[PDB]
Subunit: 296 residues, 3 copies
């Protein structure tokens, strides 16, 4: 047997098909079993319409055996394209072996696995091309467009392997494929899924700034398009046409890395924001608010 | 030497260039020598115009040695994108080693080889991403659009390796590349080519139904758009707006799998067709006709 | 560690980021250190605007250490998409190991490496799909469109690895990536870069012909669209509507191989040009001029 053929068959029982059907629509994706009690991690755009229209959409999970078991949504995060599902009273579950994305390096051979029983189901192969790469993603329905700090691969991520696992050569999940291929790192997926199981939601830091990307010889970074009122930004003293160069301890190259940098901050703690303002380098102090006050 | 470099050089003498020229046009493709007497398998869209306009198109085969030998068409199958060519009185032919596509699995390393002396000739590498995947194909000229049950690969199939072999790591032909890459399985190619050598044509089962794809919670499958008159379908009792869910022993997920499912049936034998009709599951009995009565 | 992970890390210190910034623009690319004295080979379209607008563009080189050192342009060749840069007084430089592209074969595993600290920086993997393939390229600004005789790979060449090295499994540079991926062969890069360091420019042979591609049964090749006046062509006796089939010792399949064939000729020596003219095969004699008389 081949190297990739063995690594793929080992995790095929850990990858499931997720279907959401109505009287007029049908959406399919891939999921990963990450817990023996029935917790299934997928991405948020696979199930989005079922969450925003729960009255008319029905989500079921289909296993490698062909078994079709109904599924309930535990929680979703459009800002990370992540979602946790629950099947109830299913035994002998082959749980995926979750790895550590901080141990992943450029050149490492990977497998992007989709659910074997899926319609357009695909299993592609490649290497890790980039680490900690901010990539822009579109929101499925009323869902927000977001940016994740991602693992890039030259293996193809498509509709047939999206939501499935990015797998190393030890058959461990290092990422969640999201549809020049990108995946959500597993260390991010473990942190987000842990909160979606416990609280049914996750809270992220907000500043109240909109940014456009700028790159020249004077100052390259994120240019402030609007400062919301009463926001942590306008209280800390950020004005419009400011060029952010570092949020906290992370430098900001464009508007996409700015979105990721805000979302690694701590809610309530003061954070330094360095900006270039009409040729003057100005460091400012802002305390990030929570995006969900009542769930915080 | 490398792994893929060795497997490729081993079959380079089995892959040939196929050119079809006129006073104003020129078409090129790749072929595979599958018989020592001079039988060359390619796909039908490489030679289509030469078959429909035989008066003005000339087909020649170019070997790895640079030798240009005239070629005659034995037979073609637009429904499988397959064609058999004949070069006459050529010696010391390196015949390709034909394999078994039922032994192929997901993750297996493959090589999509084009003719080495071709203009845009390409040799790509990848893995098998899906097996028994129905894929839609367009007909070259007056040729019919069709659907094959295919081997999917993340290796690129393009104009430079189309008609050439999909090759395993034992340097055996497992498929015929047809231009997210797809190939015709070799077990299908052996059955079709055997009939094109003997009879110069192959006969496929027809039912007389046109289908559109439908997917909802009531019934997902192939929805009947039209039932031809005097067809096996309307005699067996299929009506319009019916949703086919299984043809014979094969379930039908969409209109594309319906095309493949009809074409695996037996001509003249009664076959069960299960349909969902206004909420009622109805199994029906149809006897498939031959598409070519005089060649049957 | 993995095979590709080891080969990549070995050359990461030899690949640098090249940025060109103005008051309103910023361009980034990848470069390769090929000399211990500070000579950096990239492609010409990365730096083009900085060369045509040197008054307003500033080019700097960023190393794997994060070190930013100013860079000066030694010379460029739009006809090969090649450029040589110079950093001054930089020590402990990890110079890339340059290989031999004539020893490269189809199926050989390759790595297309971009600068690790680049914004859209990518490292992709693939094989060599074709050798000595003429590929058309577009000129960046006032730069001329050209055709190179290239190494084709199924590894992706994009904005993040363009200008970086194509690397074999011995971690040797076999090509310069230029953005179905193509690279400039290293033997061509050694010849062009040697002349750009010494003379600051390279001289190529010119004939004065414009060609369009033609392919039929009478004569396939490059059809002469215009013959410039006083050119080597019209003196040697080439007329319009002529179909070139061989330039020197190289046959010509289309207009793209004609561009490459002229550029391998010797300046000043008589060369045979075979053409098909109204059904008559006519061999003609032309002496190629230099494109830069004062630098010749």
């Amino acid at each position: 047997a081949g190297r990739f053929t063995k690594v793929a068959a080992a995790v095929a029982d850990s990858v499931v098909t997720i279907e959401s059907v109505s009287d007029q629509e049908g959406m399919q994706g891939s999921g990963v079993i990450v817990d023996g009690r029935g917790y299934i991690v997928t991405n948020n755009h696979v199930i989005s319409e079922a969450a925003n229209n729960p009255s008319q959409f029905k989500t079921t999970v289909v296993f490698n055996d062909g078994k079709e078991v109904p599924a309930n949504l535990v929680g979703r995060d459009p800002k990370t394209d992540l979602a946790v599902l629950k099947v109830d009273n299913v035994d002998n579950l082959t749980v995926a072996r979750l790895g550590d994305s901080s141990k992943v390096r450029v050149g490492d051979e990977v497998l992007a696995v989709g659910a074997p029983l899926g319609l357009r189901s695909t299993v592609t192969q490649g290497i890790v091309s980039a680490l900690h790469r901010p990539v822009p993603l579109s929101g499925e329905g009323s869902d927000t467009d977001t940016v994740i700090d991602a693992i890039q691969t030259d293996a193809s991520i498509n509709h047939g392997n999206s939501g499935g696992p990015l797998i190393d050569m030890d058959a461990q999940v290092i990422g969640i494929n999201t549809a020049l291929g990108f995946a959500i790192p597993v260390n991010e997926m473990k942190l987000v899924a842990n909160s979606l199981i416990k609280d049914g939601k996750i809270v992220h830091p907000t500043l109240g700034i909109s940014t456009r990307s700028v790159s020249n010889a004077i100052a390259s970074g994120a240019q402030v398009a609007n400062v919301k009122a009463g926001s942590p930004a306008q209280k800390g003293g950020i004005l419009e046409n400011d060029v952010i160069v570092k949020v906290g301890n992370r430098a900001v190259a464009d508007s996409d890395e700015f979105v990721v940098a805000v979302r690694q901050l701590a809610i309530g703690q003061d954070a330094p924001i360095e900006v270039v303002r009409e040729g003057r380098h100005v460091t400012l102090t802002v305390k990030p608010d929570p995006d969900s006050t009542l769930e915080h």
